[PDB]
Structure formats: structure tokens, C-alpha cells
């Protein structure tokens, strides 16, 4: 169940279509298992990198490509997925909060990048980077302040499960009884580091915390 | 999603706690090298040996050896833990050599508190990648320094 | 509130700024003579 | 300078216009300053015409244009003053704009060389240009005013509020040019870091005016422009300025909360702001209410103060006991105006005895009825119940009083239909006197009802 | 004078025969503030029929006062005895003309002024009370005889057509719609005022305007005027049919119990008013390549891009004024270098690198910042693009120590 979900989320079309074909076959005998796994997989990756986390990495990589590698087409392709996720609308208060503080600047900067593709003037692209760099400075000043996350603020769907038939990740053998996920802690801690990993504590069906 | 191994702490933090308790600066060895030669990074190969060899002679490396004994409730437990540490570091040295592991800085080395075992993390640089890079190419198969070799046993390695 | 027509919005803008400015600049730049 | 006022108009005009060029030789700046003042006095005598004042308008602008390039601030200040008396009708303004004089007018705005007298004259000219014809305002001058307002506080510019007040005036007669140059963003960012009650009210009113008429709402985005004021409360880590000193970082957050609170109150008292913040779809009111349920102590203590001012309720005193806080909200509490030095009995009797009118409509009740119904629809009552039973000791008491005040306000101002789902509190019944829920949470909900019960007695007694 | 209000609110025995007469003499006091306070507390006393009948039999002179006296004098028309006394000298006819041309729209100003003073922090030169001011049409419909005059004049037809055909384009004609919504609302505050108001089917027109209106100010205005219609049992029944509930109790008993009404009404679903149709956003409707591949000294071992003869300080005057053409490969390569550094300075990515590149040019070649055309090109670029204030002041400051001899030479000749 776990490897197939990763394949179904791949960017490649060949892997995406092939993975989903196997998944729908599993829905016959066990439909509720795959549905829970898809919900868990989408929420876990959301918590790992937030909206302001993706922009900090995307803008930093895009800036190096444009000013260091002198590549323009490679800069746009990095920023296209970032603007695509904001057009689908926020699904939580944290995403809603981001869409209010930085919503106007990012959306307007896309418009200037759209005029550069047609007019071709260098000034349009330069004026676009004025908004991108202004947001980058603001985000970089609040990353160190991030040290703890509340599940209600980032993803309300994780704390409203209270029961799952999906086994705890990393522990499954055919010769042992299956242990399922019971609940997820309402708060997780962020370790102060360059990558800022999160500490997620689950709750097994046998009363043992993982 | 990486599982969390309990009862284990990294080597860098383990030494740091010992030195700060004994009123010892964390970077005494580094300070001596800069004091003798401020432009240490720009020195030639033969000149860096002179600075490096001088630093290790003025400071006795036994922090790890005394660290393990002070955390052992009894001598019977101390000997058992030391035996496990000696033969767990040797296995990862040869296995890591075949795999070509690199960038084995102390932050990527963890020592089990209850059993004395050695755990490796961050398996990112493999197959001699770190040796061929142009930025500080390390030229050693595995990490075996004076701090580690002075804790396995008194007779040496 | 019924601050709808520009006639009362203009008066509100040029009165609050003059009355509640610590620096004596709006009292000199917002003269009604220039209309 | 000696004002002749004796020879013919063309003869008096020649000397001043020939001395403005001078080829930068043989004429001192003092004489130029005196001649410019003569032109202003002369223009007040002979009316604006190309037949009586010798040459045409275009020739006068050319020589007047060679006055803002002087290295003396006194000469430039007089040159700007002369233009204001010359520009009267749209015909002259279009001629001035034709010669690209706006390149020099915008130049004098931002030189910052201890010429506050020169800068005042430049801005007074701008207000004249807007009045004469606001549809032909140059884009070069506009971009200068935006820069001096967008980043006019980090450079310690003293004429920062004097330029924002001009952008708002221009935004009411020509919003098209202001929108292109990002002028509407500057006004929104100014109210975040402006903690003056009267100024903050005026700035937000200009933006809400553009959201009133149907033909002007095209200049404002949907859910990112107006909702900027909700960022300090919705975002737990808000950084308004990318570059600021870290010494007053703690004090910066408090300043943002005070300024943002007045903006929220201001936009909730205008019909153009109530509707835009309470749209049936995704709206800012749900985000404001939704963030209240999150167990954050800093945000909760701030949002409660906002709710009291929205409904205009007296704030209680900070405490951990309900009795002390209850006594601080009674309508019969003593006030300084009741003393013998002030209104002896006349002032006191006004707030105690009731008004002698039982049928006269009270328009303020209608405003509170609509506002209260909007919050109930979005789930204000459900949010308060969570705060009461899941917050600090000194926060639950403030929420308990607020819930009691709303219930009293709602049983005599709301109609029959809105009262069927009003006095029910479905979420409170979930956390009732039951052993399934934690025992500590069980008694807090029970004690809240007991504390709220005594609030009924105070209203029953009335003022005394 | 202020102490007579507490005696009014305390229900002092027989206050209407000795207290009213002491508030009429106090009207003619020398101080204007004292007289103004007497009017304030006299209006509050008029809410009782016993006190209002006392004033009519005293027939005081309130015409010489301001608008406050005029409104208080218009309340006599609500009593049949007071209407006959006033409508004997030809007074109601004069007021009808005044309340149709001069200050029928000014009633909106009185409504807005009180609301603005209440909660706006405006103060035109705590929970207050905002009561509806006295309106001529709202007081004339209390009796059948008064309602007869309002129907023969045929004013309802004039007001109704102003609602079904609104012109929400000019701000001056929008206030006329407001001047009619408040006039229709006061007419519907009485049972006899509703008989001649619902015969033209105008209430549904207001209800439609209260939920589907382009101007949000008109939408909020209709909320208040619908409350005035809910002051009677008959009025509240009409609003209930169109899904608009209202409060059906007075204010003398603030504790309603299930079995004169105050003016308040709200829709059953509050979201029916907060719906606004979406409107599309208005925005929706070279040497640079070679410079990075080489060096400034390497290349050395027309230049203006956006330079047309309509937006230049010197070139635009060739035809209109009659100036002479400007006169001059080593220099054309410096114009491009200056312009490209200004453009790169608009991104604010590396300001120090770009600022250094401009200072060196002004040092090695101080005479390149002396051509009027280059200044116009830079000034033109500062308008379209956006620059930080410290960076914007850096530019336009390298041209401060210039002469611009060409403009001075040509301007002197043509002007002389
Ligand atoms: Zn030119």
C-alpha cells in the first residue's frame, strides 16, 4: 500500500497511470484501506513542508538559476508548481493565513512574469523580481521563529481520525499480527536545524507510542 | 519518514556536555591551530601537517574514554559496554568501506547509551562520491581518529 | 456609517490628517486655498 | 528686486524671463529669486491670457522650466510657486504636461537636502494639478509619491503622512493610474503600522469607497486586498517589514495589534466592508472566528478585546474570579462625571433612569442586530464555548461575560426567527455533566453555567 | 434646565401642568446653550400624549429657532387638535413645498450626521442613542384627515417611480433615491399610511432592492427603512410573507413573553443580503546579452532605447518652439552601460554591486552625465519601473551638478 501511493503521486505520466491501475484493482477486495492511506499520505507530506517552506526553497533555487546560471526558461519552470497550488485554494487556516499576508504580492508578480513572455522587455522581468525578493526577505525572517506546530492550525484532518485500519509505517511482517494506527498526537515539535525536521508521535493499537 | 531510535545521542553532543562540565572550551584544538598559523586553510600540505601535529601533542585526547566510564554504574557494566563498542565500530568500518560511505562527521555518529553500540545515519554520500569532489576531497576510507582509538582498549587497535 | 459620497470622504481625509499630525506639515501642505 | 509696475506688460515680462536663463553667467541667484516674486505679483494684476502678457503660454513654461534645475533651494521653491499660480484651467495643464515638466516636478519631491520648504511647495502644486484635471495626472509624479509613502518610514522622512493624504485624494478621482502603480497596496500597508485613531479611520474609508460603486470594484482583488488587515491576528508569526531592528521586536507585535484592531473595527462599521467580509463563500469572518478556537493564548486575549469594541461593550477588569469581574460591568457603577463639581444629579440620572420613549425607533439597535446575526450565522457562539472550557483562568472569565452580554443583547433586539437556534448552544451540551469526558473539563462547563447564572440577576436588578 | 429632565424621567406627579410651562419660558433665555438644552429635554417629554396636548394649548413660538425648533413644531400635526390650529393659518401647505424641494433630501443628512457622530470618529464641525428624527410625512399620516392631504397632492406616485427606476451612476442622483427611501419608510409607519402605500405595490420593490443592488450603500439603507414598516402589526405581517421576520414587542417591557412595535426587521437567512456578483479584475481584461559575455574595457579596445521625439526634455521642443538639433562611438558605449545598471537596480537584488558600477563611471568619465537626452531617458524609466526610495534618491542625484547648456542656449534665442 505504501510504495504504490508514492508511485501514484509521481510527476511522470507513465508511472502515474500505471500505479492507479493497480490501486483500483485493490479497491475490489479492500476499498477502505486505500482510501485511508491516500488521506494519510496527502496530509503527512503537507505537514512536512508548509506553503512558506516551499516558497523559501523555490525562490532561493530560482534566484540562483536566473542570476548565476543566466537561465530564464529554467526559472519559470521552478515557480510554475508553486503558483499552481495557490490557485486551488487553501484547505486550512495556515494556508488561509499565508494567502492573506503574501497573497497579493505573489499573484501580482505572476502577472508581470506573464507580460514578459509576450512583450519580451527585460524591465518587465526585472520588475517581477522586485515582488519576489520582497516576499523572500519577509519569509526568511520568520523561519527561525517556527519551533512548534499545532495540528488544528496546519491540518485539521489528521486529529479527526481517531481510528484507522492502516498499519503503523515501517512495522509489518506476515508472521506477526498487524498493528494499526489508533490516533495522532495533537501537537508536534520542530527540531531547530537547517532542514527543520518534525517529530511525529503516533499511537499503536496495542497502547504503545511510536 | 524515519523512525526515531531511543536511548541514543550523537557523538558531537556527547563530547560537548563533558567539556562544558569540566570548564573546557569546545574548540581548544581549533584555537591552537589558528593561534600558531591564522591562515591555516591556505597552507600547503607539508605545512598543515606541522600545525596539525602540534595541536594533537599539546592536548591529550581522552574525553571519550573517560566519558563512557563516568556513565557506567559499575565496573562490570563498563567492561561489557566497552566490548560492544569496540566490535560495533569495526563492523561499520569495513561495511562502510565497501559501500564507500563518506562525510562521517561526529554529528552523523550516534552511540547507544544502554548498550554502547554505534549507529550511523545520513547515508547520502556513497560509492566514493566525497573523494572525487573539488571542495575538500577527503582521502580516508573511514573515520578512525585518536578520540575513538583511545576508548576501545588501552593496548590500542 | 454612511461615508459614501466623496463630498464627506474628502472632508474626513483633510480634517483627520491636519488635526492629528504631530509634525506641522499637514497643517501647511493641506491648505484649503489650493482647493 | 524693485517692482516696476509702471511700464507695459510685455516690457515688465521681458526682464524676468530673460533673467531665468542668463546662460549661468552675469546674474546672481538673489536677483532671480526677486524676479520670480515679481512675476507672481504681476500675474495677480493682469489676468491669465496670451494676449495681454506678451508671449504665449508655451514660451513662459520654457523659461520657467529653467528654474527647478538651480542649485539653490530658494530659487526652486519660488519656481514651483509660480507654476501653481499659472496653472488654472485644463488648457494650461495639458500644455505643461506636453513639455514633460513632470520629469522635474517629481525630481524636486525626493532630494532630501534639508529643503522642507521646497518640498512643501512641490506637494501644494500636486494638489492644484489634481483639482484642475485629475484625468491627466502624470505617471511620473505618481510613482514618486508611492515610493515616498511605501518606504517613507525607514528613511525617517517627516513628510510621509502629507503624501499619503494626497494618494487617497487622487484614488477617488483617478483610481486607474493609482491601481497600476500599486498605490492601493501602499494605503493597505500604511494602516498596519499607523496607530492613530483618526488617521487610520480615514485611510481605510478610501479603500472601502472603491468597493462601494459597481464600476470601481474592478480595481480591487477578491480575497487578498481587504483581508490584509486580518493578517496580524490570523498569522501567529507576522513580519510586516522585511528590514527592522530586533531591539523592539517584542514591542513591534503590540503596535501591530493595536493598529490592526482599529482597522477591523473601522471596516465593520461600513456597509461596504460588512458585506465584503461576510461573503457566503470563503470569507475573512470565518477565518477570524476559526482562529479563535485554536488554543493560542496570545491571539485569544487579543480577539476578545476586538469583539467587545465591535459590539461596544464595557471591558471588565483582569482577574481570575467571576464575582470581581461581574461587579466591574454593572450599569450603576460610579463615574467621575457624577461628582458635585461636574453634573451633580443631571449626569447621573441620565445613565440610571430610562429614556421616556417606547415607540421611537433606535437606529443603533438595528445596526447591532445585523452584526450580531452575522456572527451567529458563522458560529460565534460555538467558538466562545470552546474558549470558555479550554483556556486560561483569566481568559475564560472574559469570554463568559462576553457570552452573557450577547445573550442579553439578543433576546430583546433579535426577531423571533433568529431566536430558535440562538439560546440552544449545541456544542455546550456535548461537554455537559457526564463522566465520559475528562472530569476537569466537566466541571468547567458546569461552573461556567453557574457563573453565567449570576449574570442574569444583575440585569434583573437594573441600574440603581 | 438640565435638572428638569430627572423630574421628567422620575414620573413626578402632575408634571405636565407646571413642568411644561417652565420649559416654555426657558426657551426665550438669553444664552443659546441653555435654550438648546431646553429643546433637547422638551422633545423627550413630547413622547407622552399628556405632555404633547399641553404644548398645543400653549401655542409657543418655535419658528424663530433653528432646525431643532422646526422639527418639534412639526409634531403638532400628529394630534387632530394641533393639526386644526396649524392648518388654519395656511402652514401645512407651506411645509409641503419646503419638504419637496428645499430640505426633503436634507433629511438624509440629518440621518447620516447622527449615525456618523455615533460611531465613526468623525465629529463634523459607551453606547449612544440614535433616534429617528421627526419627518413631515411620518407625522401627517397618524390621522385620516392628515392622510387625505398627502394623497390629493399625489406624492406617492412621484416617489414610487424613483424606486423602480434607479440611476446608480451619478452620486448626486443616488442621494435622490435615498431621499425617497426614507420618505416611503416614514409613510409606512402607520396603519392608515400603509393602506395607500401597498395599493401601488411598492414594498416588494424595496425588498428586491435590499438584496440585489450594485451599490452597497443603497443595500444597507434599505435595511433601516424596512424596520420603520415593521412598527405595526399589519406591517409585520407583510414582511413575514417575503421571509423577513421582525420584533413584535415594544420597549416598555424589555422581557418579551409569548401571548407600538419598535422598528427592526431582519431576513430569515442573513446570507441573502451578503451576496455580491463577481466582477473581473481590470488587469485580466541587445547590449545586455553581450555585456555579460565581455568587459567594459574589452569592447572599447542612438544609444537610447526608448527615445522618441515626444517625451524628451529637449527634443520635444524642436517643432513647437524651434530649438536647434542636439550635437555630439566611444561615448555611445557608455550610454548603454549606464542604462543597463539603472535597469538592474530596479530588482534590488544586489544594490551594492550596481551602485558601485555607477559611481566609477562618474569618476573616470565625469562628463557622461551632462547630456539632456540621457537624463530624459532615465527620468522616463523611473516612471514605468519601480525603485526603492533610497535607490531612487541615488539616481537623480548624479545629475545635480550639471549645467545643460544646450537647453539654456536655445531657450534664450527663441524667447528673446
Ligand atoms: Zn532627446
Author numbering:
A (entry chain A): 1973 to 2182
B (entry chain A): 2236 to 2392
C (entry chain G): 2 to 36
D (entry chain E): 25 to 488
E (entry chain E): 733 to 857, 872 to 1005, 1423 to 1448, 1479 to 1494, 1510 to 1536, 1607 to 1694
The authors write:
DEPTOR-mTORC2 overall refinement (map 1), focused refinement on symmetry-expanded protomer (map 2), and focused refinement on one protomer classified for the DEP domain tandem (DEPt) region (map 3) were used for modeling and illustration. (e) Fourier shell correlation (FSC) curves for unmasked, spherical, loose, and tight masks, and corrected FSC curve for the map 2 reconstruction, yielding a gold standard FSC resolution of 3.20 Å. The PDZ domain core (aaDEPTOR326–409) adopts a canonical PDZ fold and binds the TRD2 subdomain of the mTOR FAT domain. The interaction interface is formed by a conserved surface of the PDZ domain and three mTOR helices (aamTOR1525–1578). The canonical PDZ domain peptide binding groove is present, but remains unoccupied in the interaction of the DEPTOR PDZ domain with mTOR. In complex with DEPTOR, residues aamTOR304–317 are ordered and the backbone of residues aamTOR290–303 connecting to the Horn is visible at lower resolution. Residues aamTOR304–306 interact with the DEPTOR PDZ domain and residue FmTOR306 is inserted between the DEPTOR PDZ and mTOR FAT domains as an integral part of the interface. Residues aaDEPTOR309–325 provide an N-terminal extension to the PDZ core domain, while aaDEPTOR304–308 bind a groove formed by alpha-helices 14–16 of the mTOR FAT domain. The binding interface is well defined with a local resolution of around 3 Å. Local resolution for the PDZ domain decreases due to flexibility with increasing distance from the interface to around 4 Å.
